Enzyme design. Structure first.
Site, PDB file in Angstrom:
ATOM      1  N   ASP A 136       0.830  -1.210   0.000  1.00  0.00           N
ATOM      2  CA  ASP A 136       0.000   0.000   0.000  1.00  0.00           C
ATOM      3  C   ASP A 136       0.862   1.256   0.000  1.00  0.00           C
ATOM      4  O   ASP A 136       1.269   1.713   1.066  1.00  0.00           O
ATOM      5  CB  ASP A 136      -0.932  -0.035   1.192  1.00  0.00           C
ATOM      6  CG  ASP A 136      -2.024   1.006   1.221  1.00  0.00           C
ATOM      7  OD1 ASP A 136      -1.900   2.012   0.502  1.00  0.00           O
ATOM      8  OD2 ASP A 136      -3.026   0.830   1.943  1.00  0.00           O
ATOM      9  N   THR A 137       1.088   1.853  -1.162  1.00  0.00           N
ATOM     10  CA  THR A 137       1.930   3.039  -1.248  1.00  0.00           C
ATOM     11  C   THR A 137       1.190   4.264  -0.695  1.00  0.00           C
ATOM     12  O   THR A 137       1.865   5.260  -0.447  1.00  0.00           O
ATOM     13  CB  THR A 137       2.366   3.375  -2.688  1.00  0.00           C
ATOM     14  OG1 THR A 137       1.194   3.519  -3.502  1.00  0.00           O
ATOM     15  CG2 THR A 137       3.204   2.222  -3.202  1.00  0.00           C
ATOM     16  N   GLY A 138      -0.106   4.158  -0.472  1.00  0.00           N
ATOM     17  CA  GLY A 138      -0.860   5.192   0.222  1.00  0.00           C
ATOM     18  C   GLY A 138      -0.821   5.146   1.707  1.00  0.00           C
ATOM     19  O   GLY A 138      -1.358   6.057   2.378  1.00  0.00           O
TER      20      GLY A 138
HETATM   21  O1  LIG Z   1      -7.396   2.083   5.934  1.00  0.00           O
HETATM   22  S1  LIG Z   1      -6.692   3.152   5.267  1.00  0.00           S
HETATM   23  O2  LIG Z   1      -7.193   4.491   5.206  1.00  0.00           O
HETATM   24  C1  LIG Z   1      -5.069   3.182   6.006  1.00  0.00           C
HETATM   25  C2  LIG Z   1      -4.344   4.376   5.962  1.00  0.00           C
HETATM   26  C3  LIG Z   1      -3.065   4.334   6.561  1.00  0.00           C
HETATM   27  C4  LIG Z   1      -2.570   3.170   7.123  1.00  0.00           C
HETATM   28  C5  LIG Z   1      -3.301   1.978   7.141  1.00  0.00           C
HETATM   29  C6  LIG Z   1      -4.590   2.025   6.602  1.00  0.00           C
HETATM   30  N1  LIG Z   1      -6.236   2.620   3.685  1.00  0.00           N
HETATM   31  C7  LIG Z   1      -5.990   1.224   3.414  1.00  0.00           C
HETATM   32  C8  LIG Z   1      -7.122   0.315   2.987  1.00  0.00           C
HETATM   33  C9  LIG Z   1      -6.745  -0.866   2.329  1.00  0.00           C
HETATM   34  C10 LIG Z   1      -7.687  -1.796   1.908  1.00  0.00           C
HETATM   35  C11 LIG Z   1      -9.026  -1.493   2.107  1.00  0.00           C
HETATM   36  I1  LIG Z   1     -10.439  -2.860   1.530  1.00  0.00           I
HETATM   37  C12 LIG Z   1      -9.430  -0.321   2.723  1.00  0.00           C
HETATM   38  C13 LIG Z   1      -8.469   0.586   3.180  1.00  0.00           C
HETATM   39  C14 LIG Z   1      -5.997   3.609   2.643  1.00  0.00           C
HETATM   40  C15 LIG Z   1      -4.455   3.664   2.377  1.00  0.00           C
HETATM   41  N2  LIG Z   1      -4.273   3.446   0.944  1.00  0.00           N
HETATM   42  C16 LIG Z   1      -5.491   2.759   0.449  1.00  0.00           C
HETATM   43  C17 LIG Z   1      -6.661   3.332   1.262  1.00  0.00           C
HETATM   44  N3  LIG Z   1      -7.363   4.534   0.802  1.00  0.00           N
HETATM   45  C18 LIG Z   1      -6.648   5.732   0.321  1.00  0.00           C
HETATM   46  C19 LIG Z   1      -6.159   6.665   1.461  1.00  0.00           C
HETATM   47  C20 LIG Z   1      -4.796   6.988   1.556  1.00  0.00           C
HETATM   48  C21 LIG Z   1      -4.294   7.830   2.559  1.00  0.00           C
HETATM   49  C22 LIG Z   1      -5.191   8.360   3.490  1.00  0.00           C
HETATM   50  I2  LIG Z   1      -4.563   9.599   5.024  1.00  0.00           I
HETATM   51  C23 LIG Z   1      -6.545   8.027   3.422  1.00  0.00           C
HETATM   52  C24 LIG Z   1      -7.037   7.203   2.418  1.00  0.00           C
HETATM   53  S2  LIG Z   1      -9.047   4.571   0.929  1.00  0.00           S
HETATM   54  O3  LIG Z   1      -9.499   5.973   0.870  1.00  0.00           O
HETATM   55  O4  LIG Z   1      -9.367   3.868   2.175  1.00  0.00           O
HETATM   56  C25 LIG Z   1      -9.900   3.788  -0.382  1.00  0.00           C
HETATM   57  C26 LIG Z   1     -10.825   2.780  -0.031  1.00  0.00           C
HETATM   58  C27 LIG Z   1     -11.545   2.125  -1.036  1.00  0.00           C
HETATM   59  C28 LIG Z   1     -11.343   2.451  -2.385  1.00  0.00           C
HETATM   60  C29 LIG Z   1     -10.433   3.457  -2.742  1.00  0.00           C
HETATM   61  C30 LIG Z   1      -9.750   4.129  -1.721  1.00  0.00           C
END
Ligand SMILES: O=S(=O)(c1ccccc1)N(Cc1ccc(I)cc1)[C@H]1CNC[C@@H]1N(Cc1ccc(I)cc1)S(=O)(=O)c1ccccc1
Ligand SMILES: [Cl-]
Ligand SMILES: [Cl-]
Ligand SMILES: [Cl-]
EC number: 3.4.23.16
Lengths: 99, 99
Positions: free
Chosen positions: B25-27
């Site tokens: 997860d690069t986000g």
């Molecule tokens: O749960 S999370 O917000 C997270 C953030 C930091 C550390 C751990 C977790 N997550 C991961 C995620 C992975 C799988 C699933 I199913 C749902 C969430 C993010 C991080 N990058 C992807 C996900 N998202 C992007 C994001 C990035 C940074 C931030 I600040 C907020 C949102 S998301 O907006 O949630 C998302 C959810 C569903 C469809 C598209 C986007």
């Protein structure tokens, strides 16, 4: 380009004739941008993760330009804390993870 | 390897002697795993996600393997939607984004 992960992978995008900054996010299925207008039809969706869920509007077949690469795909719009380019558009610009 | 993004970039990790599935997860700034037992002391950490901030447990200098690549670094534990390998460990194994 080759983008390092020492910092958040932020790039410039062009959408709806606006220039914005967004995060290249391999953990996101979908592209999600802060509140903005987009043309066309839309349907509501909920997306969620740490902290809970948000309601977004789903717009399909939207043109976008990502770090100079043109693509088309679905864009979700709603109260995201950060603009996110998700896999639905990263694939279209040929973005890969490499190690 | 080179991982394309047509599907979720789910990989096998090893931690505490056990194999688990996790998302590259690069986000995510940080690595966050589902509730598990880890050794040592932990400290509190607030992290931001799509629905807001939450508090999780921070463990430092933890051995973890990602796709066979050995790493040692900070692992957060909390109610994550899926096991997530974030930029701190992606950087350590030499992962970049490329297009
Ligand atoms: O749960 S999370 O917000 C997270 C953030 C930091 C550390 C751990 C977790 N997550 C991961 C995620 C992975 C799988 C699933 I199913 C749902 C969430 C993010 C991080 N990058 C992807 C996900 N998202 C992007 C994001 C990035 C940074 C931030 I600040 C907020 C949102 S998301 O907006 O949630 C998302 C959810 C569903 C469809 C598209 C986007
Ligand atoms: Cl799409
Ligand atoms: Cl491809
Ligand atoms: Cl670390």
């Amino acid at each position: 380009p080759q983008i390092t992960l020492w910092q958040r992978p932020l790039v410039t995008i062009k959408i709806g004739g606006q220039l914005k900054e967004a995060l290249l996010d391999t953990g996101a299925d979908d592209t999600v941008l802060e509140e903005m207008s987009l043309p066309g039809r839309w349907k509501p969706k909920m997306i969620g993760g740490i902290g809970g869920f948000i309601k977004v509007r789903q717009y399909d077949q939207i043109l976008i330009e990502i770090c100079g690469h043109k693509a088309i795909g679905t864009v979700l719009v709603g109260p995201t804390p950060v603009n996110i380019i998700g896999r639905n558009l990263l694939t279209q610009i040929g973005c890969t993870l490499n190690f």
